[PDB]
Amino acid sequence: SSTLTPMHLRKAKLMFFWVRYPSSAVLKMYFPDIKFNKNNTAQLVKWFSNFREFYYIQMEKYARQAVTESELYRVLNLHYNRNNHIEVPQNFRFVVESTLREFFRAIQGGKDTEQSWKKSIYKIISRMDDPVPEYFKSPNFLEQ
DNA sequence: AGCATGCCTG
DNA sequence: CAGGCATGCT
């Protein structure tokens, strides 16, 4: 297969539970069924850029509504795991907290007025990827 | 140019 | 999510 099928995406979204900034080097490894090339690679990578934005958009929101002043998972889980195909790995539940803690810190400190202030947060989150489970390489995984 | 990042759009 | 565009390095 040379093209990313709609399952490849359903799959990619799941991986996001373990990795926010996967290296293209690693992405390939988890898609042995795909013969990459400038395009599909660019595309797969774009997917994650997209997964990240939605994610941070959600983080900054919850963080802000909180400052002023859970089910937020329904949101995140709906977005990346629509049919609850797998169980949300605990690491993810911690990455989330880490992320929310950072935004809350930044916002509450008004340090959110500076341009590209989210950047700091990003560098921090980028070191939190975890190794994506081995069975994600399994041809049989894509099925189910 | 030719491929990668990133922001931001619809 | 895919398109566009501005950008930065080669």
Phi-psi region of A48 (alpha: psi -120 to 50; beta: other; left: phi over 0): alpha
* Three-state secondary-structure class, residue A71: coil
Which nucleotides of strand C are protein-proximal, with an atom < 7 A from a CB?
1-3
Q: Which nt sits closest to A115, CA to C1'?
A: B7
CA–CA separation, A32 vs A117, rounded Å? Answer: 37
Residue ranges of alpha helices (H) inside chain A are: 6-15, 24-29, 38-68, 72-81, 90-108, 118-125, 139-142
Four-point Cα dihedral A13, A14, A15, A21, nearest 10 = 40
Q: Count the neighbouring beta carbons within 10 Å of the beta carbon of residue A110.
A: 9
Burial group, residue A120, by CB count within 10 angstroms (0-12, 13-18, 19+): middle
Calculate the alpha carbon distances from A91 to A95, A112, A119, A138, A140 in Å: 6, 27, 22, 22, 24
A119 touches strand B (CB under 7 A): yes
Q: Which CATH class is domain A1-144?
A: mainly alpha
The A 28-47 residues near strand B by Cβ under 7 Å are 38, 41-42, 45
Angstrom resolution of this structure = 2.8
| A21, A129 Cβ separation under 8 angstroms | yes
Torsion of CA A9, A13, A19, A23, to 10 degrees: 20
Going from N- to C-terminal start, the domains of chain A cover: 1-144
A123 touches strand B (CB under 7 A): no
